């Protein structure tokens, strides 16, 4: 059979928080350098931060993609971030 | 006076008894209590200056309250402060869409 | 009762010389300076229960992520000299 | 610099994880554009709990309570 | 025949509200709604006017934001008349309920 792997090992499917961690860590450092320069930043807490903004961007994209198919359209145009932005109070 | 002093106006003892009075901390920090006054006494005159150049705007002497509306609501970086609560008998900023013109 | 109506008075007087005001302005203005410094204090309140202790650093730094950084700058800045001004 | 450093492919698994498998041409710059709008804004509330806690290095305790305030 | 075309005096007349700053709702059928929604929980409420005005400026402040917000929204598609789908899509997306 071909299903019942798909119905087995497919009764868990989750998906994971992506953003690579020393693209992620370099761009932080880089902005933070700015702010206050020679600033170290500790190897903890930084997950956390990688969850929270992970967690606000999905949560961006499922507007996003509610304001899509609204448009009867599944592609995204720069006026539904915008408008998504603007509505949502920031 | 203290406000003279300081160079202040607003009354700084009225807020000292009023932050006793709240008891967010045992003992306040007296070395500047008029600190968080001043703060205040600056925002107020920007609040104020606004208001002042909306009515005079209008050829209106007295404050109008649309016009501190106006006042407060054109200021991005005022309505980014307070953007969450409206004005009694305020108003909107005239804003008609350009592609809904005939 | 102790009113505020004198000091945003005489702000006005020393901003505007010739504008008047009116009688529900000036219940806008009472109520915005009133929950201003209510917002800002226990800012300061919860910044004080922030360090892990029972002065003016608090609410400087409580000024300064509470308002936009643009008019934050001269806040504390008028502050201070304010302060100097007052410490003799 | 290094802003560039997140890559096409990562915005296109972080689209999929949102659903729907339409990607535009520059959505990746529109989500670059969003989190240089939101993670600058929570690296700057750490960095005032950094000045209002005399540390020069950040902590769990203090980077997350000037991150709740978003919302 | 004086007639124009349908959306040629809307322009105008939006115009002259923006401008004004008035109560936009009757006082009295206000006190009617208000009375009714409020005999519900308890007798001899005995409300005074300065609240029933209160929340009056209040509920039309808040359905003139909705209202633009849903017209944002409904011009983002090529649409220029109002459709429940816009009113629902104002209510959930900013979670208000």
């Given at each position: 059979?071909?299903?019942?792997?798909?119905?087995?090992?497919?009764?868990?499917?989750?998906?994971?928080?992506?953003?690579?961690?020393?693209?992620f860590?370099?761009?932080?450092?880089?902005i933070?350098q700015?702010?206050?320069t020679?600033?170290?930043?500790?190897?903890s807490?930084?997950?956390?931060?990688?969850?929270?903004?992970?967690?606000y961007?999905?949560?961006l994209?499922?507007?996003?993609?509610?304001?899509?198919?609204?448009?009867?359209?599944?592609?995204?145009?720069?006026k539904?971030?915008?408008?998504?932005?603007?509505?949502?109070?920031? | 006076?203290?406000?003279?002093?300081?160079?202040?106006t607003?009354?700084?003892?009225?807020?000292?008894?009023?932050?006793?009075?709240?008891?967010?901390?045992?003992?306040?920090?007296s070395?500047?209590?008029?600190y968080?006054?001043?703060?205040?006494?600056?925002?107020?005159?920007?609040?104020?200056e606004?208001?002042?150049?909306?009515?005079?705007?209008?050829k209106?002497?007295?404050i109008?309250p649309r016009?501190?509306?106006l006042?407060?609501?054109?200021?991005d970086?005022?309505?980014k402060?307070?953007?969450?609560?409206?004005?009694?008998?305020?108003?909107?900023?005239?804003?008609?869409?350009?592609?809904?013109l005939? | 009762?102790?009113?505020?109506?004198?000091?945003?008075?005489?702000?006005?007087?020393?901003?505007?010389?010739?504008?008047?005001?009116?009688?529900?302005?000036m219940?806008?203005?009472?109520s915005?300076?009133?929950?201003?410094?209510?917002?800002?204090?226990?800012?300061?309140?919860?910044?004080?229960?922030?360090?892990?202790?029972?002065?003016?650093r608090?609410?400087?730094?409580?000024?300064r992520?509470?308002?936009?950084?643009?008019?934050?700058?001269?806040?504390?800045?008028?502050?201070?000299?304010?302060?100097?001004?007052?410490?003799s | 610099?290094?802003?560039?450093?997140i890559t096409?492919?990562?915005?296109?698994?972080?689209?999929?994880?949102?659903?729907?498998?339409?990607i535009?041409?520059?959505?990746?710059?529109?989500?670059?554009?969003?989190?240089?709008?939101?993670?600058?804004?929570?690296?700057?509330?750490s960095?005032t709990?950094?000045?209002?806690?005399?540390?020069?290095?950040?902590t769990?305790?203090?980077?997350?309570?000037?991150?709740?305030?978003?919302?």
């Amino acid at each position: 059979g071909t299903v019942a792997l798909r119905e087995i090992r497919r009764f868990q499917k989750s998906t994971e928080l992506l953003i690579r961690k020393l693209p992620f860590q370099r761009l932080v450092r880089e902005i933070a350098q700015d702010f206050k320069t020679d600033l170290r930043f500790q190897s903890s807490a930084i997950g956390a931060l990688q969850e929270s903004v992970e967690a606000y961007l999905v949560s961006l994209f499922e507007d996003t993609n509610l304001a899509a198919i609204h448009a009867k359209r599944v592609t995204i145009m720069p006026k539904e971030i915008q408008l998504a932005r603007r509505l949502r109070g920031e | 006076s203290r406000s003279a002093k300081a160079g202040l106006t607003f009354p700084v003892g009225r807020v000292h008894r009023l932050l006793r009075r709240g008891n967010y901390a045992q003992r306040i920090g007296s070395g500047a209590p008029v600190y968080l006054t001043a703060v205040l006494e600056y925002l107020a005159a920007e609040i104020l200056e606004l208001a002042g150049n909306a009515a005079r705007d209008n050829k209106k002497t007295r404050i109008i309250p649309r016009h501190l509306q106006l006042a407060i609501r054109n200021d991005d970086e005022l309505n980014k402060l307070l953007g969450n609560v409206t004005i009694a008998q305020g108003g909107v900023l005239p804003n008609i869409h350009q592609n809904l013109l005939p | 009762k102790e009113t505020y109506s004198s000091y945003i008075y005489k702000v006005l007087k020393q901003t505007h010389p010739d504008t008047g005001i009116s009688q529900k302005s000036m219940s806008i203005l009472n109520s915005f300076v009133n929950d201003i410094f209510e917002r800002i204090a226990t800012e300061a309140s919860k910044l004080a229960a922030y360090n892990k202790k029972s002065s003016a650093r608090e609410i400087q730094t409580a000024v300064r992520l509470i308002l936009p950084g643009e008019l934050a700058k001269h806040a504390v800045s008028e502050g201070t000299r304010a302060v100097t001004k007052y410490s003799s | 610099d290094n802003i560039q450093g997140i890559t096409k492919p990562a915005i296109r698994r972080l689209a999929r994880r949102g659903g729907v498998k339409r990607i535009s041409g520059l959505i990746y710059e529109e989500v670059r554009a969003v989190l240089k709008s939101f993670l600058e804004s929570v690296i700057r509330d750490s960095v005032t709990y950094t000045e209002h806690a005399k540390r020069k290095t950040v902590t769990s305790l203090d980077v997350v309570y000037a991150l709740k305030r978003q919302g």
